[PDB]
Amino acid sequence: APAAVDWRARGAVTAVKDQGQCGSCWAFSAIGNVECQWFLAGHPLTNLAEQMLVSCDKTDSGCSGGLMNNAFEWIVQENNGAVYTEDSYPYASGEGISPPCTTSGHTVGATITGHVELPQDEAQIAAWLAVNGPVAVAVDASSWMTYTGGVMTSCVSEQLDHGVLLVGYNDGAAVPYWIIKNSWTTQWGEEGYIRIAKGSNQCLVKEEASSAVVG
Ligand SMILES: *CC(=O)[C@H](CCCC)n1cc([C@@](C)(NCc2ccc3ncccc3c2)C(C)C)nn1
């Protein structure tokens, strides 16, 4: 694979968002991945609606959590592949309460046909990401609250508790790293991003990687 990749260099990644006090990280991880995959299939970059998942995907648990893989499955099996625009279905769960689903009057921003669950191996995930784009991952983020910047070497790596988006890596750096988009505003971390050391399963990053498939 290339020594380094950063999909932000192509304009493939939307701006950092804010999940607020809702346990909706699963939705931000899944939607961020769909946004990037939609752009990379040769279509324009479009902000898509976490709130569609939080309120309407009844196979997940709203502000009480979910699974990116369930989200991808709901989109295909229950929503005809469709993902609405953020522009047409804005986030409304910042206080921790998910409002009931609105089915009407949103606008379709993207479609997907399925998803893949990637091998539990950082080199294999990197190789897939280098060609196919950003990848949704679960991590242990219990040690992340106080992170401000640099390449994390000390991640507490015990229990998956958070969903984020891998957008790149750099194997040529003094400490090789992953580049991860979070959903905790641009005030957190490196303008909303974190770098973690690559190659030692930091934060359990290899354990539950997946992506939407766009035709
Ligand atoms: C990150 C975040 O906002 C929440 C924290 C918990 C909610 C207060 N989060 C964590 C997850 C993970 C770990 N999945 C847990 C989970 C919760 C509910 C649920 N419902 C149905 C099926 C499966 C579920 C799993 C996720 C990052 C892998 N999700 N939200």
Task: Please supply descriptive tags for the structure shown above.
globular; Cruzipain; 4 helices; 215 residues; alpha+beta; monomer; two-stranded antiparallel sheet
Report on this model:
This is Cruzipain. Disulfide bonds join 22-63, 56-101, 155-203. Belongs to the peptidase C1 family. Glycans are attached at residues 47, 170. The active site is at residues 25, 162, 182. It is classed as hydrolase. β7 and β8 form a beta hairpin. This protein has helices spanning 25-40, 50-56, 68-78, 122-132; strands spanning 4-6, 82-84, 108-111, 114-117, 135-139, 151-152, 162-170, 177-181, 193-197, 209-213. 21% of the residues lie in helices and 21% in strands. It is built from four helices and ten strands, in the order βαααβββαββββββ. The strands form two sheets. Strands 1, 4, 5, 6, 7, 8, 9 and 10 form an eight-stranded mixed beta sheet that branches. The longest helix has 16 residues, at 25-40. With 215 residues, the protein is of the alpha+beta class. α1 packs across α2 (50-56) and α1 (25-40) crosses α3. The protein is globular and about 50 Å long. The chain has one domain (1-215): Cysteine proteinases (Cathepsin B, Chain A, Alpha-Beta Complex), CATH 3.90.70.10. The structure holds ligand KB2. The ligand *CC(=O)[C@H](CCCC)n1cc([C@@](C)(NCc2ccc3ncccc3c2)C(C)C)nn1 binds at residues 23-26, 60-61, 64-67, 70, 138, 160-163.
